């Protein structure tokens, strides 16, 4: 076999890494080191929830974000309540929900006489998955992947620190955004300047407070921060758009828990599974991930869904296809609880069923490509022959975590695939920059080896 | 040296251990298993902060809680505001609060003409460590270590649950404590309990939301829940304490964010260092040892302590002692972040230089005696001769995480320092309680092993 060990020589020392590859063509393991230990798989993980969606959800899968009511229509009033049902697109911009809104305004809808429901019951429980870090939980890659998701659960703040050293940066939020910021950075001079850190402190009903400083910019730059209380702002911008639409409404936000029962006004369906799955897996994409992680369980259980049903039904679909787990945790669809463990050699089996059928299933496209497009379009280590426009393969981020799962042609036209992860990878402090120039080489000579070998 | 490769085929398949130890006597190191590789040092981390508490805070630090004003007393009245300084003390009882504000009635005041000032100063930015998880912070163990911190900022409540399936549980939290919990939890039936889960929802204000569902129960189902906003709980009390007092107050409870000067009118001092850093080590506290990390650098740097400067002064001050961290990350006292990363190795280095320095330190006496007391009184591994009554060691325990490290007498009389980290240890789904059948095992020969060689 390959000698992995003499390639994590040149890795920082410290880490730890975990390779595992298959010549599928000849059923022979190629590289064999640490393949059973349990890591860190990071954004990886979407590789289970992309087999498993493709199996329970199916190809025409879309997500429906819909307008219900009880009430009769009736001289233009709609004479009850305006049920609005979402079920966890992660892929809804704020237009889309403009235009199904927009509906009722076709229908002859000019005044809700009644109040404004949300329907969020497929989902259950906590927005977000157990052994998430607490203070991601503000940045935008890591916004609540929740029933009502509008414009990916995201906004941005206007900030301009071209001040003084002790002058106050000012931070306006967007006309757009139905969220207050609150509290006071001010510019550090250049000695406090590396040192700074801007703290972001959640409150209720969507206010986030700001401290900290930040080093002098001279051009305004906006910063993005993820949504806290979906339905809150889902609700907020609701009434937005009929007031926009100039449809009346003068009535209570309700945010009931179960099923609203109603007769459908109107509706709007998501691009289908190819669509999310390709964009989850090229862009590595949470959101996207985490919905269908328990999109999978309410469709499957047929019951609203919480992260552990989401863990009970991607484990169930995947047993069923011969998919051995052991006692690996696989607390989300994402990758991103620090709670996950995953060795190489179960990676590499979901690997090896999406190589054996890819006739059926088609998600060998969904793989970012090397030197060509997703994650690894510039991957250092990738972007030469004979790797580049050859090595396909899911990108594993997280602080301190640079994994690979995928799969390459080799020099006798065979394909090879392969888990790479590498854990506890340090060159500075927390919140230094990570130098990466250990991880090229590393990463250049393991996938030119697999390539001759 | 010990071949510990075969003794960890006991540990559950996809764990991975980092294993050091030294004979001091002959300095040999006798086992040296993945001793360079980072993993998580869970609350072993506490070693660093004892040892830079002891060297820059010194035996006779205690923390200081405290009353000051700027108004003359006159006529029975203070004729000024209240300050109450908060320094960290995580040993603060409210006894001890209402004592101390009781000094105020002998020094003739029985009424209060201004505001009510909490000074935290000392502290600053975020009371949490930055890695910690975020589903954790409503629990105690994980309550925040900030400046404000009375009967260890916990609370606990009852949820009576001994009611038919569909009734609504109810909430009973004791009259003394001013917080809400709040919600409509209802006993599921037998089919649909495996599906439920008991969630709590922080709101502003120490305000919580139980939600979800449980099993009918059979006995009253504690909650012991972490404060969340810990200056508003303390000022609560304050103002609840003088009224019990006889001390009249009408003004507004004011938190000014900066520290506040006056006369010291009374100062409460918790027990010394010793007492502090023995309670820590013995019983794992985790709120001991972070308030100890930030004094330590609100000390050493003299100026409010934030995390990150915590990790400074530990490394600065361990570093002129010798200590080499490389890389690590350090991003707490306590150890409880995920993104903390230690190699066995280091961790030794600071166990010989306790060992070396015991005649100054005195911190052989704090760590758990292996059958005896502390965190290891009952450890299944080390309770039988030649390990009960001899091994000494900090446990580290999470999510996934078994570590020791200690120190131990062998066959010849001659003194072993051990490190033993465990991570990646999984024993079934991520919600069951861990078998710790497998750990007893691998930990009973380890310490056999050191013992005779």
Known sequence: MINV????????????????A????????????????????????????????????????QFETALLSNGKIQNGNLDGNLIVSFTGDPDLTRGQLYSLLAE???????????????????????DRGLGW?????????????????????????????????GEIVKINVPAQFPIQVFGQVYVADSN????????????????????????????????????????????????????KLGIEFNGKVLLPQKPQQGQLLAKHLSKPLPDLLKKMMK?????????????????????????????????????????????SILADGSGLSRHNLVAPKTMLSVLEYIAKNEDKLHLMETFPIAGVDGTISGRGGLISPPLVKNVIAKTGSLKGVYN??????????????????????????????????????????????????
Chains 1, 2 share one sequence.
Not at 5 to 20: F, M, R
Not at 212 to 241: E, H, M, W
Not at 426 to 437: H, I, P, Q, V
Request: charged letters at 20%; glycine letters at 6%; hydrophobic letters at 40%.
């Open 5 to 20: 060990s003499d390639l994590t020589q040149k890795l920082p020392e410290g880490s730890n890494a975990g390779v595992i």
């Open 22 to 61: 298959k010549n599928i063509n000849q059923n022979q393991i190629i590289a064999d080191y640490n393949g059973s230990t349990f890591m860190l798989p990071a954004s990886t993980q979407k590789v289970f929830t992309a087999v498993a969606a493709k199996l329970a959800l199916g190809d025409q899968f």
């Open 104 to 126: 009722l305004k076709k229908q002859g809808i000019k005044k809700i006489n009644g109040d404004l429901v949300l329907d969020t019951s497929v989902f259950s429980s906590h």
């Open 133 to 165: 870090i607490w203070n991601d939980l503000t940045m935008c890659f890591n916004s609540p992947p929740a029933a009502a998701n509008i414009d990916n659960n995201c906004f941005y703040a206007e900030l301009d620190a071209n001040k003084n050293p």
């Open 192 to 243: 406090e300047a590396p040192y700074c850190q801007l703290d972001v402190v959640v409150h209720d009903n969507n206010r986030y407070q700001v401290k900290g400083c930040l080093a002098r910019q001279y051009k305004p730059f906006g910063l993005s921060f993820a949504v806290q209380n979906t339905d809150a702002y889902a609700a907020a911008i609701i009434q937005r758009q009929l007031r």
């Open 283 to 327: 862009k590595s994409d949470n959101q996207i991930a985490d919905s269908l992680f328990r999109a999978v369980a309410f469709n499957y259980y047929k019951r609203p869904a919480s992260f552990q049903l989401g863990t009970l039904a991607v484990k169930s679909i995947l047993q069923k296809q011969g998919i051995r787990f052991g006692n």
């Open 404 to 453: 690979l799962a995928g799969f390459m042609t080799n020099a006798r036209g065979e394909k090879v695939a392969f888990v790479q992860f590498i854990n506890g990878y340090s060159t500075g402090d927390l919140e230094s920059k990570t130098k990466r120039a250990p991880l090229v080489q590393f990463e250049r000579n393991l996938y030119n080896e697999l390539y001759k070998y």
